[PDB]
Amino acid sequence: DDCIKPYGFCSLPILKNGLCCSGACVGVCADL
């Protein structure tokens, strides 16, 4: 367990992943 870093890369070609701590992924981890 971990999360992906805010403004780190979350463009993981794994399905049901791209799990940013700040939630949103736009290739990089974003926020909303």
Return the H-helix or E-strand segment holding 28.
strand 28-29
Query: How far apart are alpha carbons 29 and 22 in whole angstroms?
Result: 7
* Among candidate residues 5, 6, 25, the one with its CA nearest the CA of residue 16: 25
Domain residue limits at 18: 1-32
* Amino acid letter for position 24: A
Total domain count, the chain: 1
Query: Which technique?
Result: NMR
- The residues, any chain, with a CB within 8 Å of residue 12's CB and separated by 6 or more, are 4, 18
CB 21 within 8 A of CB 5: yes
Return the H-helix or E-strand segment holding 25.
strand 25-26
DSSP 29: E
State the residue for tokens 């290739």.
27
* Amino acid letter for position 4: I
CB 24 within 8 A of CB 32: yes
Angle, CA of 22, 26 and 32, to the nearest 5°: 40
